[PDB]
Every structure is written in C-alpha cells, then in structure tokens.
Amino acid sequence: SAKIVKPNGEKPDEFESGISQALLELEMNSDLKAQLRELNITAAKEIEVGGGRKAIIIFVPVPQLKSFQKIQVRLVRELEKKFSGKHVVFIAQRRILPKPTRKKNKQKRPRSRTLTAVHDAILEDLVFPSEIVGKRIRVKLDGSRLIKVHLDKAQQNNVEHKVETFSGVYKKLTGKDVNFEFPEFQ
C-alpha cells in the first residue's frame, strides 16, 4: 500500500495493496531495524495449489535475496500470521536471456543467467530451510519427465505441509512437475 517496500523496473503494482503493507507494519522481530529501512521486494503472484489453497509468492531483487535468507523463518511466521490460510515462499526475479542462434553487439550470455541454471536455482531458495541432498529426475515412460528432490531431514521440522504447494509453485513458474522425498542420512 506504499511505494517504499515495493519498487519495480516498471510502473504496475496490482495486488500489493495489502502485500507491501504487510511488511511495512510489523514491529519487534529479530532484525527489525536492518530490514524495514532499506530492503525491498519486487512483485507477487497469488497462484493456486490443490483446491482452494492459495499461495502468495514474493519476487525479490537478487543481491538482497541473501539478506532475506537470514530472516526468512522469522518472516514466514509473521506473513502467515497476517495472511492466514496462506503459504509464503521467496523466489528471485532472475531474468532469462534467450539462447542465441543463427538469426547489435551483444556480449555473451553468462551461464549464471541461462535457462538450465535458472530453473535449478529456483529450487534451492524455494526450499530454503531444507537444502537439496539429491535429485533423481526420472522419465515417465511417455516422454514426460518427473523430478524427485531429496531434502535433508536435518531441518525436516518445518517442511511437512508445504511440499504439495512446493510442487504447484514450481509448476507455474517453470512448467515441470516435481515431488519431494525425505531420505535417510548417509
């Protein structure tokens, strides 16, 4: 509801009349001072998983995505307190550059910002509190493939309900379905 926490590269700001206001308002969390004063978010999508189970996502400028990791668990709790019945994830706006081809002086596309490295880097901030300890992409007998992501179970104690909204938000943003598994320690 204000132009401070939510900028863009462009003018449009639909569906942030309570979203950017949701983190203007809050008081006395751990790291209150170095968060409300200078950091910012970019955009938000309100997509669906399952049935009537909405999930607001936050698009983040990349150099301060690292500054959202050290306060994320003490930001998920407040944003889910205010927005009840709702899940909160943090995904960077990462800006795909197209694969060059036969068809001015464009210097070359860094592989940090390629389509393979983006659709991978979308996961390890999607599952922030559990990192990824394996990946077992498996083709489903008909050309359709399926990604099995193994999370660590050393921080299992928060990611139990978010796993089916993890696959739904990964399907809308990327286009490919996953499912998550919790294998034993090695």
Partner: protein, 82 residues
C-alpha cells in the same frame, strides 16, 4: 543377483564401497571439534590433516599428519560435528 535395485542401495552397502563408484559420490572425510586440554579454544580441525596443527595461546601441538587419517597427539576431548 539379476534384480539388485541399483538405484536404492542400503546405506550399509553404501558405506562399504569406494568414495568414487557410488550412486552419488560422497567423501569419507569429516570435520571434528577438538578441545586441547587446558584452554577454552575449540579447534575445528579437518580429519585427514596434512599439516601439524598448533594451538594459538597454549601453543602445544594438537595433531600429527600420518598415512590416511591424522593421529591426534594427546588423548583429548573430541567430537564429530555438523
């Protein structure tokens, strides 16, 4: 043994192979916390050390590098971390 499901091995069989050759490879190294006797300073020394690790204030020798896995000098306080 025509039907070993060689995508899901048991972790016991996973431990008793090479550090290469595994289904996903993973090293047999670890990091260990070592209290030298007589100081507050926890050391975070690597297991397969190659250097002679010295302590900062009470500057006695902590471990000895040897063949595979470093032998600690004194019987000392010691734990495997992470």
């Amino acid at each position: 043994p025509l039907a070993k499901d060689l995508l899901h091995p048991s972790p016991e069989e996973e431990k008793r192979k090479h550090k290469k050759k595994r289904l996903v490879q993973s090293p047999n190294s670890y990091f260990m916390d070592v209290k030298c006797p007589g100081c507050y300073k926890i050391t975070t020394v690597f297991s397969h050390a190659q250097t002679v690790v010295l302590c900062v204030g009470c500057s006695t020798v902590l471990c000895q590098p040897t063949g595979g896995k470093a032998r600690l000098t004194e019987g000392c306080s010691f734990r495997r971390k992470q």
